[PDB]
Structure formats: C-alpha cells, structure tokens
Amino acid sequence: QVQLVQSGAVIKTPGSSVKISCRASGYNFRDYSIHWVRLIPDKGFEWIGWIKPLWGAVSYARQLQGRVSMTRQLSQDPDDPDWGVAYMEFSGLTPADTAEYFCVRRGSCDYCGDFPWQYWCQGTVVVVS
Amino acid sequence: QVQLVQSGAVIKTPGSSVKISCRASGYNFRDYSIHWVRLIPDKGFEWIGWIKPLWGAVSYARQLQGRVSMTRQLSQDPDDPDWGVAYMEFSGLTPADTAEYFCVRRGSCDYCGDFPWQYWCQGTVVVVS
Amino acid sequence: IHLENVTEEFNMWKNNMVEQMHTDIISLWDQSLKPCVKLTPLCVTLQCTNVTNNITDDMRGELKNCSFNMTTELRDKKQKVYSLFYRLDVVQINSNKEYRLINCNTSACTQACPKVSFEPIPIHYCAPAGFAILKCKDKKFNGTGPCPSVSTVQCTHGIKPVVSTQLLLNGSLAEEEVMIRSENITNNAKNILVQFNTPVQINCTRPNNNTRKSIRIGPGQAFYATGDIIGDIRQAHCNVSKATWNETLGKVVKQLRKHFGNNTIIRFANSSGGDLEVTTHSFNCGGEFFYCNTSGLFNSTWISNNDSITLPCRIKQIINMWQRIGQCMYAPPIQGVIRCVSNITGLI
Amino acid sequence: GVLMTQSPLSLPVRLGDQASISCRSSQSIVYSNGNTYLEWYLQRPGQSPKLLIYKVSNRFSGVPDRVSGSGSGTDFTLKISRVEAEDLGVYYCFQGSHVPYTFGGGTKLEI
Amino acid sequence: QVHLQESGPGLVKPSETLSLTCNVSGTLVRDNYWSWIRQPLGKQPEWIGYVHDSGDTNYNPSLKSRVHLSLDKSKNLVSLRLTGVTAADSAIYYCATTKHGRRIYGVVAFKEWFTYFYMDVWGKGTSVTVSS
Amino acid sequence: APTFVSVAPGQTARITCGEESLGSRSVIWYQQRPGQAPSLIIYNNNDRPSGIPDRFSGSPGSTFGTTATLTITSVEAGDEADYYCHIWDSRRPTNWVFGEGTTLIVL
Ligand SMILES: *[C@@H]1O[C@H](CO)[C@@H](O[C@@H]2O[C@H](CO)[C@@H](O[C@@H]3O[C@H](CO)[C@@H](O)[C@H](O[C@H]4O[C@H](CO)[C@@H](O)[C@H](O)[C@@H]4O[C@H]4O[C@H](CO)[C@@H](O)[C@H](O)[C@@H]4O)[C@@H]3O)[C@H](O)[C@H]2NC(C)=O)[C@H](O)[C@H]1NC(C)=O
Ligand SMILES: *[C@@H]1O[C@H](CO)[C@@H](O[C@@H]2O[C@H](CO)[C@@H](O[C@@H]3O[C@H](CO[C@H]4O[C@H](CO)[C@@H](O)[C@H](O)[C@@H]4O)[C@@H](O)[C@H](O[C@H]4O[C@H](CO)[C@@H](O)[C@H](O)[C@@H]4O)[C@@H]3O)[C@H](O)[C@H]2NC(C)=O)[C@H](O)[C@H]1NC(C)=O
Ligand SMILES: *[C@@H]1O[C@H](CO)[C@@H](O[C@@H]2O[C@H](CO)[C@@H](O[C@@H]3O[C@H](CO)[C@@H](O)[C@H](O)[C@@H]3O)[C@H](O)[C@H]2NC(C)=O)[C@H](O)[C@H]1NC(C)=O
Ligand SMILES: *[C@@H]1O[C@H](CO)[C@@H](O[C@@H]2O[C@H](CO)[C@@H](O[C@@H]3O[C@H](CO)[C@@H](O)[C@H](O)[C@@H]3O)[C@H](O)[C@H]2NC(C)=O)[C@H](O)[C@H]1NC(C)=O
Ligand SMILES: *[C@@H]1O[C@H](CO)[C@@H](O[C@@H]2O[C@H](CO)[C@@H](O[C@@H]3O[C@H](CO)[C@@H](O)[C@H](O)[C@@H]3O)[C@H](O)[C@H]2NC(C)=O)[C@H](O)[C@H]1NC(C)=O
Ligand SMILES: *[C@@H]1O[C@H](CO)[C@@H](O[C@@H]2O[C@H](CO)[C@@H](O)[C@H](O)[C@H]2NC(C)=O)[C@H](O)[C@H]1NC(C)=O
Ligand SMILES: *[C@@H]1O[C@H](CO)[C@@H](O[C@@H]2O[C@H](CO)[C@@H](O)[C@H](O)[C@H]2NC(C)=O)[C@H](O)[C@H]1NC(C)=O
Ligand SMILES: *[C@@H]1O[C@H](CO)[C@@H](O[C@@H]2O[C@H](CO)[C@@H](O)[C@H](O)[C@H]2NC(C)=O)[C@H](O)[C@H]1NC(C)=O
Ligand SMILES: *[C@@H]1O[C@H](CO)[C@@H](O[C@@H]2O[C@H](CO)[C@@H](O)[C@H](O)[C@H]2NC(C)=O)[C@H](O)[C@H]1NC(C)=O
Ligand SMILES: *[C@@H]1O[C@H](CO)[C@@H](O[C@@H]2O[C@H](CO)[C@@H](O)[C@H](O)[C@H]2NC(C)=O)[C@H](O)[C@H]1NC(C)=O
Ligand SMILES: *[C@@H]1O[C@H](CO)[C@@H](O[C@@H]2O[C@H](CO)[C@@H](O)[C@H](O)[C@H]2NC(C)=O)[C@H](O)[C@H]1NC(C)=O
Ligand SMILES: *[C@@H]1O[C@H](CO)[C@@H](O[C@@H]2O[C@H](CO)[C@@H](O)[C@H](O)[C@H]2NC(C)=O)[C@H](O)[C@H]1NC(C)=O
Ligand SMILES: *[C@@H]1O[C@H](CO)[C@@H](O)[C@H](O)[C@H]1NC(C)=O
C-alpha cells in the first residue's frame, strides 16, 4: 500500500510561520517526488511546489517565492528504509492563506507522467485570525 | 576406520542403576544410528533399542520400557566433529540381568539397510550381586 | 498433458530431487543471514532477576529481567541496559545469581534482520531442456511400485516449504481416502507417513503483548531486545477441535488395520524422549518459533470392534536448526498479541 | 482424480426466483494456455444431456439470457436469475483442463 | 439478620497474651469465611486476614508468628489470640464475615485465575488499649 | 494524607485511589462513616451488591496503566464518609493493607 498521513488542522495568528509534516510510508521514499498543492475555497486548485528527497532538490511556484521552504528527512537504517517525512514551512501569513493543503505523490505506473497524482494526504486546514 | 570403545565390567547390587558409555570415533557421528544389543548366556541375542544422535530420537523394545534410557553427546567444535558419546542408563536390576552388552553401528554401505551391523564394541559384562 | 498404455515403477525412498532440495534450502537459508548483524559484543555477564509477578513456591516463572553493561556507538563510554529473556536461553555461571547466554561457549550468533520474513511461499521446480518430469496420477497408490497412469509435466505444482517435526502443516490433501505410506512396515526403523483427507484446523496463539526496544551496539548496529510486557503474563497455547480429532483418528485406525490383521489393539503414546524439538513439535508462526507439548492428542487406545483441546507451548528465541556446528539464530521479538491458523494434514 | 464436489444437490426452486449451483474441484482447472474449459449440462428425464455454457462465462449458442457461470480456481457457481419448468432436472459440471475428465453427481432443480 | 459482638480485656499491658471474642447472630461458625481486621486511629485498616474450618487458615505475613485465630463450635463464637502486645497495637479490632469470588482472565486449565475476597458485613469493635 | 473531595451536592465526584494498574484487576470500594463500622459499596470492578444505592459507578478493570477511580453522582449530607479502595492486581502480590483514605465532604 501507499500511505500519506498529514498533521492536524491549526489556528494561526496573522504573520506567523506554519509547519506541516507529510509523512509517507509503504514505498521506497528515495525514488518519487512529493508535490504540495493547495485548495482555496472558491478559487479552484493552485499548485505550490515540489521536492525530490534524494538530494532535497526543490522547486517553487513563482508567486510564492521568498515565503515557502521545504525540507525532508529520510530513514537511515537497514531495517525500515521505507518511511519519509517532508516538512513545509510557510511564512508571511495573510488572511487569504486560509485554505486546505495537500501533499501528493506521482502515480506509480511507468507510463504515468510526472504531474498526474494518485495518492493524496488527508488535507490540512489552515485558518488565519 | 570405525572404532567403538566401551567401559569396563561392573559388580552391581540388585535394584540399582548402571551406566554404560559407548564412545565412537572415526566417522561423522551425526549420520548413523547407534543400536544396543545384549547377549544373555543360554538365551541367545536380544535387541534393546536404537538412537539417532542428530536429535536423540530413541526407540526401545516393548518388554523393557520404563527401565532403560538413552542419551547422547555430540562433538561441538569445528575441528573434531567425529567423536561421539552414547550413554545407556539401565535400572530395575535383577540377577537375571547379568549378561554382556554391545553397542553397534549400521554398516556403511548404501544398499545394506538399517539393521545388519558391521562394527561392534568390545562388550561389557554386567554382573549382579 | 497425459500419456496412455504406459506403466513406470516409481520410488519415493531411493528417489533423488529430495536429496538436493535439503541442500538447496539450507544453502539458501545461509544466504539470508550473512548480510546481518553478528553478536560478538553481546556474550557478556548478565545480572538477572525475576520479572514482577505473583510467584509461587512450587510452580515457576518463565521470564527473566536481565541488566548488563554494553558498549555505545562511541568506544570510550558504556551504558547499562536491560531486557527480558526466557528460561531456555540463560544458564547460571557459578548470595547473587548471575547468568550468561547458552550458545556463547560454542559459537557467536547471528541476529536475523527484522526486514526479511520467514513465511512460506510457493516454489515450482522445473527441469531444464533435455529432461522431463513424470507424475503419477493414481488414486490408490502407496508410493512404491508401478504407477499405471503417468502424465508428464513441464514444472511441478505448488510446493511450499514449511518447518515442522510432528504434525506437518499446510500440506497436500489426499484425494478421497486416508493413505498411509512407508518403506517396509514390518521394519520399524523407518518412519511412517500418514496423509489424511479432511484437514484439522489448528489455532495457535501467544496472548502476551510485547514491545521491541532498540539497543545500539555500535555504528549501524541494532539489537532488538524485548521491552516491557503490558497486561497479563500468560502462556502461549494452541487449540484443536475435539470431535474432528476423534474422527480423524477413527479414520486412520481403520486404515492401519489393513496391514496388521483385524484383531489388533492399536494405541498411542507420548514421544519417548530426546532433545527438545523432537519430543514436542515445532513451527514458525509469523516469525516466531513454538515448541508445543503434544501429550494431549496421543492418549488413546482402540479396541478391535462444543469443547476443544488446548495444549501449551514454549517459546525459544535462539534456534539451532539442522544441528549445525557453527550456527545459531537469535530471532527478533515481534509486536502485539500473535496468532495463526493452519491445517494439520499429515502425521509422522 | 479431479472429481467435482457439487453443492447442493437438491434445490426445490419456485418459479420466478433465483438458483445457485456451485461446484468445487480438487485442483485448479487452469488449462496450459490460460483458458479453462468448463461446461454445464442440462437433463430432463428422457432427454440426452446437452450444454448451456462452454467456459467460465461464455455460453452455448441458443441458450437464453438467464444462466450465468462465475468463480475462480476451484469454486465455480452457476446462477439462474429466473427459473422456469424447463430448468427442472439434473445439472452437472465438466472440466476441460486435462484428461480424464470427471462429471459430478448431479444437481436437481425441483419446485 | 446478622451482626457480631466483639469483646476484649480493654486495658492491656505490653508483652501480654491478648485474646478476643466475637459473638454471632443468625449465621453459625461453620457456614461462612471469617476475617479479622485491625485499624489504628486515623489510619487505614489493616486486613489481618481470614479463617475457615478445614484447613483455610492463612495469616498475614506481617505478624505471621504471634497471632493464632480460633473458633467456637460449642458456644458458636470466633476467637483470637495475640502474643506480645506492643505499643503500636492500640487499634480498634473488627471481626467480620467475607465472601469469595473467582476472577478469571485467561485459561482455567492453566491456573490463569485468582480468588479475591471482600467483607460484606462488619462488627462494632473494641479499642484495645496498650499502656502501663 | 486526606485528599479533599469537596464537591457541590448534585454534582459528580471522581475518587482516585491506589497504585497504577499493571495487570487485569478487581477493585473493591468501601466507606467509613464517622464513629461507625465500615461498609462495602462496590465489590467487583463495576458491580454493586443488593440493597446498596445506585450512582456509584466503577471503572472497568481491563485498563492497563491507570489508577482505580470511582464515579459518584448527586451527593448529599449522608454520603459524608471516608473512602478506601482495595485493588486486586493479577501481577503484584496480595495486598495486606488498604489504600489511602480519600475523605468525602459535601458542600
Ligand atoms: C483456546 O481454547 C481455550 C479454551 O476454550 C480458550 O480459553 C478461553 O479464553 C477466554 C478468553 O481468552 C476465557 O474467557 C473469559 O471468560 C470469563 C468468564 O466469562 C470472562 O470473565 C473473561 O473476560 C473478562 O476479562 C477480560 C480481561 O480482564 C476483560 O477484558 C473482559 O471484558 C471481561 O471483563 C469483564 O468482566 C469483568 C468481571 O469482573 C469486569 O471486571 C470487567 O470490567 C469486564 O466487564 C474471559 O473472556 C475462557 O474462560 C477460556 N476458557 C474456556 C474454557 O473457554 C482460548 O481463548 C482459545 N484460544 C483461541 C486462540 O481460540
Ligand atoms: C499455513 O497457511 C496459512 C495460510 O496462508 C498461514 O496463515 C497466514 O500466515 C501469515 C504469516 O503468519 C499471515 O500474514 C500476516 O497477516 C497479518 C494479519 O494482517 C492481515 O489482516 C490485516 C487486517 O485486515 C490486513 O491489513 C493484512 O493485509 C493481512 O491480511 C499481518 O499483520 C502480517 O503482516 C505483518 O508482517 C509483515 C512482514 O513483512 C510486516 O511488514 C507488517 O508490518 C506486519 O507486522 C502478515 O501479513 C496471514 O494472515 C495468515 N493467513 C490468514 C488467513 O490468517 C499459516 O501461517 C501457515 N502455517 C504456517 C505454520 O506457516
Ligand atoms: C526490569 O528491571 C528494571 C531494573 O532497573 C526495571 O526498571 C526500573 O523499574 C522501576 C520499577 O520497578 C522503575 O522505578 C520507578 O520509576 C518511576 C519513574 O522514574 C518512579 O515514578 C517510580 O516511583 C519508581 O521509582 C525504574 O524507573 C526502572 N528503571 C529503568 C531504567 O527502566 C524494569 O521495570 C524491569 N522490567 C520489568 C518488566 O519488570
Ligand atoms: C508422558 O507421560 C508421562 C506420565 O505423566 C510423563 O512422565 C512424567 O514426567 C514428568 C516430567 O518429566 C515427571 O515429573 C517430575 O517433575 C519433578 C519436578 O522437579 C522432577 O523432580 C521429577 O523427577 C519428575 O521429573 C513425572 O514424574 C513423570 N511421571 C512418572 C509417573 O514418573 C512423561 O514426561 C510424558 N512424556 C513427555 C514427552 O512429556
Ligand atoms: C498469589 O499466588 C498464591 C499462590 O500460592 C496465592 O495463594 C494461594 O491462594 C489460595 C486461594 O486461591 C489459598 O487457598 C487454597 O485454596 C484451595 C482451593 O480451595 C484449597 O483447597 C487449599 O487448601 C488452599 O486453602 C492458598 O493457601 C494460597 N497459598 C499461599 C501460599 O498463600 C495468592 O492468593 C495469590 N495472590 C494474588 C493477589 O494473586
Ligand atoms: C526468583 O526466582 C527464584 C528461582 O525461581 C526463587 O528462588 C527459589 O525458587 C523456588 C521455586 O520458585 C522456591 O521453591 C524457593 O523457595 C525460592 N528460594 C527462595 C530463597 O525464595 C526466588 O524466590 C524468586 N524471587 C526472588 C525475590 O528472588
Ligand atoms: C556495569 O559496569 C559497572 C562499572 O564497573 C559495574 O559497577 C561495578 O561493579 C563491581 C562489581 O559488581 C563493583 O565492585 C563496583 O563497585 C561497581 N562500580 C561502582 C562505581 O559501583 C556494574 O556492576 C556493571 N553491571 C551492571 C549490571 O550495571
Ligand atoms: C505397495 O504396493 C505394492 C504393489 O501395490 C506392494 O508390492 C507388492 O506387495 C505384495 C504384498 O504386499 C507382495 O506380495 C508383492 O511381491 C509386492 N510386489 C513388489 C514388486 O514389491 C508393496 O508391498 C506395497 N508396500 C506397502 C508398504 O504397502
Ligand atoms: C499491546 O500494547 C500496545 C501498546 O502500545 C497497544 O497499543 C495501544 O492500543 C490502544 C488501544 O486502542 C491505543 O489507544 C494506543 O494508542 C496504542 N498504542 C500505540 C503506541 O499505538 C496494543 O493495543 C496492545 N495490544 C492489544 C491486543 O491490546
Ligand atoms: C480457530 O479460530 C477461528 C477464528 O476465526 C475460528 O473460526 C470461527 O470461530 C467462531 C467461534 O467463536 C465461530 O463462531 C465461527 O463460525 C468460526 N468461523 C468460521 C468461518 O467457521 C475457528 O472455529 C477456530 N477453531 C477452533 C478449533 O477453535
Ligand atoms: C505435557 O502435558 C502433560 C499433561 O499435563 C504433562 O504431564 C503432567 O506432568 C505433571 C508434572 O509436570 C504431573 O504432575 C502430571 O501427573 C502429568 N500428567 C499426566 C497425565 O501424567 C507433561 O509434563 C507435559 N510435558 C512436559 C514436557 O512438561
Ligand atoms: C485449510 O483447509 C481448508 C479446507 O477445508 C481451506 O478452507 C477452504 O479454502 C478454500 C480455498 O481457499 C475456500 O474457497 C473455502 O471457502 C474454504 N472453506 C472454509 C470452510 O473456510 C482453508 O483455506 C485452508 N487454510 C487455512 C489457513 O485454513
Ligand atoms: C556450554 O555450557 C553448558 C552449560 O553447563 C554445558 O552443558 C555445555 O557442555 C557447554 N558447552 C561445551 C562445548 O562444553
């Protein structure tokens, strides 16, 4: 199986920084990309960025640079190499940033492209005072 | 070669217990069974039982169960795997039990089956007061 | 495919391809160990005590809480750490009472890696180009003597490897009847394979609840010791059904009386003795090895005219399979209450 | 043998209701290419037995759209959605993987 | 209708063989499990233990040596003897009945169960005073 | 030592007592009226005997690693008594002494 567990929803004051940890398990974490996407109410989806955990190579959307940061943490043991953690840190909060955020993975088939996602985290609600 | 050494003869009081250690060397002891046979004067031969030294799987004659017991001791070293010890414990003595005891091994050839023996210990006299 | 007007004598006893499989499985069994940890730094002085439990004077506990010095990742510092062990893995070196491990006076030991599993899987053997595999397809066929309806095949059917001494598990079912097979039944030194038809379901469990606890021995080393036991210290056991077992003995007595005369008393008894894992019967249930007393089945006699059976087990952690001179295998403890369901299919 | 175990034999089925006749084989009936050859028979007292289905699913030419076979491995169940008076009588299973083939015992539909 | 009645000497010198009695009502001495419990002033009670006819004579391992319980089938009483009264012995003492119960949690054949006890009714007490 | 269980009448009181649990247990709750003898109120983990009043609910004894509690609702002036727990843990040995007293005073 492929499992993606996020953290819980959170109240945050305006102008703070928010950390969201997407934890993946059930596959070799060093192989696939982790993308972050947001759903704002009454806007449609909006892409945010992606990370490759093999070296932590990141890339961001244009209209959110200087505000987002991505880190990762691998499993370093010969027993349980599967699980991986990807942290998102999101700063410069506005009340427009109240939305729900999703971590996703590339679809596992070989003919599947880079963007069409298969597995989805349960979604995290971020709400700004 | 195959060598089989027993212990010495013994005077024993009636109703006691006796122990006989048949020692084998010259072959891989983890492979062949060890049988025990007795010679009573004016009775002919008589089978007693057998042991497989790999796990101590024993089997006894019916008319001596509850009285006899068998143990084995392997060689646990990477240099001398060959030598092995079998112990017989024989209890519930009568003066009819005064006889001569032999430890034997199956013949080494492929087609010769389980029972026709080849090698023989030098025999031990057990004499009951 | 099939073949007609054809008769071949077979043999199971002087057959090959079983002589190489006992070499193949051992040689493959060794390969899944050499990439794993050695236990040179763990053969060390132990300081043991009884686990917290209402202990009796006559009856005895079966878990020992032991503390010991151990190295760190660094070489200068050391640490004190504790675990739980069974009675069958410590011996008393000789006020105080300090123990040691059992296998340390003969061989250093290999921890198996907890990532790999020991569960059975189907294996299909196949013959290369220039050979063939014949298969007897007879109903009534005692395994020795000419089979009258052979059929060739490219590869064998599903062959799973299990490990068990008495009461072989997940076997192949008989077709209609119950069949006994042997080499020479008037001889006794050869075993007697009994293969019956209706499988006896067996439940086996350990109700205790474990916790594993990682201890770093050095760089990249992890000794998975047993942590704390939550709940009631209970004994692992197995259940079988009473009526199904009383029935399946009634079938095999009817089958056994064909070779021995109709007027014969047949009775059953516990095993005569020896080492541990031939008196009881052993198996692996999801990564842990049992040794379970089977006096509760073979207590019978047979005249020539809702309940269940529980039977209690013991758990060793180090095994010494195939009685190899330089070998042992510390098994890793596994989490949670554990059980498994199987089909007793044949006897030996 | 590869003898079929029919379950159940007798099914007194009222007119208009469903019916389910299962067979269980001793082995898998997988033919050496991938296409198992299963067959389901008719029988009335006084007629020769004739075929309804010749596959897991694909049916004999001339058989109406109420009889269906399904299953896998060993378990293979026939399902008739609406039962008429023609459906009464003995049904069977049949194998096609390897010779000799085995018939079952015979499953009677009644009222 | 059950109640008990304790009686002791009342004023006790130290290093003295104490003795106590307990009168019954309705239920005789043969019928039920009996128990003696002590309690110091302002303290938790101390279950000294229980007794019954035919070999049910378990004691507290705290005292374990200087205490011996007794019965009275003739007069139908329950009695007690203590040896060597100390200064900490000043406590109100309770004769009482108790009822059994088998708490089962595992398999019965493997002795995975235990017996618990609980006092249903109580007595009145007698403040045994240790003093010169 | 006396834990103060000052509660308003009509409310819910929760009395904790004893050692943190290890195995499966069986708890007994008593009470001690001032100047009088003891009296049982709860005999199993969640069972009260006949004739006793209700509204004394007990926690189930299968919880592993908690302290034995006792739930009272709608207290009064007659309920003024000291309390005692008496646990029977299936791992620890036989308890030859009761718990520590949790006195109950009504507002
Ligand atoms: C193999 O076969 C054997 C033989 O049949 C099986 O052994 C039986 O095992 C079961 C459970 O494993 C056991 O059942 C007990 O029954 C008791 C009497 O009914 C119950 O009192 C008890 O359950 C209570 O205890 C648990 C642990 O404390 C609680 O979690 C549970 O909720 C129950 O507790 C309630 O009741 C108490 C009463 O005071 C109360 O305090 C609690 O708060 C709660 O309200 C057990 O379930 C049988 O007695 C065993 N023996 C027999 C002959 O059946 C074995 O299970 C089989 N194994 C397999 C794998 O099949
Ligand atoms: C005789 O034949 C029978 C039939 O196969 C065997 O029974 C099976 O035994 C295996 C191994 O003992 C069992 O496999 C284990 O099942 C556990 C239960 O999980 C099941 O149920 C959950 C809940 O629905 C599902 O999510 C899950 O997919 C299973 O269907 C699993 O928890 C086990 O996984 C554990 O081990 C792996 C090892 O890599 C770990 O990575 C996991 O994290 C986890 O800890 C495992 O999958 C199987 O369930 C048994 N079958 C049945 C029907 O119960 C007998 O074992 C065999 N006899 C002998 C002696 O071997
Ligand atoms: C096996 O033996 C070890 C011996 O060290 C046990 O570990 C120790 O267990 C005691 C309790 O028996 C712990 O003491 C308690 O600690 C807590 C918190 O510190 C405190 O609140 C208590 O009052 C009491 O002092 C001790 O901490 C613990 N030490 C360590 C290092 O774990 C262990 O419990 C035994 N295992 C089993 C299963 O019995
Ligand atoms: C087959 O059944 C027989 C009959 O019960 C078993 O014999 C019995 O075995 C037990 C354990 O070996 C003996 O118990 C005693 O235990 C004490 C414990 O210290 C020990 O000191 C004694 O020397 C003895 O070992 C019991 O005495 C014995 N029965 C008789 C009549 O001697 C036998 O063990 C069973 N077979 C198997 C494989 O279990
Ligand atoms: C901890 O385990 C000990 C094991 O000895 C338990 O002590 C024993 O408890 C029984 C009551 O179940 C005592 O009485 C005996 O009962 C049988 C059945 O009626 C009776 O026939 C006997 O004559 C005997 O009276 C037994 O004397 C007692 N043994 C000892 C040495 O104290 C103890 O109850 C257990 N405690 C806990 C908290 O689990
Ligand atoms: C710890 O276990 C040991 C060994 O089991 C206990 O020592 C003896 O155990 C036997 C059988 O359990 C009893 O018959 C003896 O009476 C025990 N000897 C003593 C001096 O008690 C030991 O009691 C256990 N407990 C502790 C606290 O050490
Ligand atoms: C772990 O190592 C320590 C350090 O040596 C041991 O503590 C010493 O033990 C010896 C023998 O028992 C005593 O003579 C010393 O006095 C102890 N040292 C100190 C500072 O007290 C300890 O015994 C080892 N084992 C365990 C289980 O802790
Ligand atoms: C297995 O079956 C074969 C033939 O079905 C048996 O072989 C014959 O057995 C009879 C009596 O058992 C003898 O009179 C014949 O001489 C045997 N023929 C041969 C060629 O051996 C065989 O004995 C059976 N084995 C067992 C163990 O039942
Ligand atoms: C064995 O012990 C573990 C200890 O963690 C139990 O796991 C806990 O189960 C409870 C019950 O739902 C959960 O609330 C906890 O969150 C669990 N702990 C963890 C760390 O996940 C486990 O349930 C026990 N086994 C059984 C059969 O009860
Ligand atoms: C072994 O355990 C399995 C667990 O599923 C048992 O199967 C079920 O047992 C319950 C008993 O409470 C029955 O009510 C169910 O009908 C059983 N399931 C099925 C599909 O039959 C099984 O009975 C156990 N076997 C033994 C011998 O105890
Ligand atoms: C296997 O189970 C049997 C059945 O309980 C055990 O035999 C009992 O052993 C005790 C002593 O340990 C004796 O007091 C009983 O009399 C025995 N029962 C019978 C019917 O003889 C046997 O000990 C168990 N196996 C092992 C290795 O302990
Ligand atoms: C043990 O043998 C039984 C035979 O009765 C197997 O049970 C049947 O298995 C088939 C194939 O998996 C199923 O279609 C049937 O529904 C099963 N019957 C029942 C009553 O469950 C069983 O699978 C075998 N294995 C185990 C682990 O029990
Ligand atoms: C290892 O120690 C055990 C315990 O005394 C002993 O029985 C065994 O003989 C020892 N091993 C060797 C090879 O001496």
Numbering used by the authors:
A (entry chain q), B (entry chain Q): 1 to 129
C (entry chain C): 84 to 141, 150 to 185, 187 to 309, 312 to 321, 321A, 322 to 398, 411 to 453
D (entry chain L): 1 to 111
E (entry chain M): 1 to 82, 82A, 82B, 82C, 83 to 100, 100A, 100B, 100C, ...
F (entry chain N): 6 to 9, 11 to 67, 67A, 67B, 67C, 68 to 95, 95A, 95B, ...
Question: What's written in the study?
Answer:
To further understand the structural basis for development of antibody breadth for the vaccine-elicited antibodies, we determined cryo-EM structures of two additional vFP antibodies of the vFP1 class, vFP1.01 and vFP7.04 (8% and 10% breadth, respectively), in complex with BG505 DS-SOSIP Env trimer. By using a similar strategy as was adopted for the cryo-EM reconstructions of Env-bound complexes of vFP16.02 and vFP20.01, we obtained cryo-EM reconstructions, at overall resolutions of 4.2 Å and 4.0 Å, respectively, of vFP1.01-BG505 DS-SOSIP-VRC03-PGT122 and vFP7.04-BG505 DS-SOSIP-VRC03-PGT122 complexes, where the antigen binding fragments (Fabs) of antibodies PGT122 and VRC03 were added to increase the size of the complex and to provide fiducial markers allowing better particle visualization and alignment. The cryo-EM reconstructions revealed vFP1.01 and vFP7.04 bound to a helical fusion peptide, in what appears to be a signature for this class of vaccine-elicited, murine antibodies. In all four vaccine-elicited antibodies, vFP1.01, vFP7.04, vFP16.02 and vFP20.01, a conserved mode of recognition was observed, with both the heavy and light chains sequestering the fusion peptide N terminus and the light chain making additional contacts with gp120. Buried surface area calculations using the coordinates fitted and refined into the cryo-EM reconstructions revealed a 1.2–1.7-fold larger interfacial buried surface for the light chain than the heavy chain. Although the light chain made a larger footprint on Env than the heavy chain in the vFP1.01, vFP7.04, vFP16.02 and vFP20.01 complexes, closer examination of the electron density revealed greater disorder in the light chain density in all the structures. This suggests local variability in the position of the bound light chain that was less constrained by its interactions with Env, whereas the heavy chain made a more stable interface, albeit with a smaller footprint, interacting primarily with the fusion peptide with some interactions with glycan 88.
Structural characterization of the epitope of bnAb N123-VRC34.01 (subsequently referred to as VRC34.01) revealed that the N terminus of the fusion peptide (FP) is one such site of vulnerability. Xu et al (2018) used the VRC34.01 epitope as a template to design vaccine approaches that elicited antibodies to the fusion peptide capable of neutralizing diverse strains of HIV-1. The broadest of these vaccine-elicited fusion peptide-directed antibodies (vFP antibodies) derive from a class of murine antibodies, the vFP1 class, whose members share similar B cell ontogenies and structural modes of recognition. While the murine vFP1 class antibodies share VH gene sequence homology with the human VH gene of VRC34.01, the binding mode and antibody contact sites of the vFP antibodies are different from that of VRC34.01.
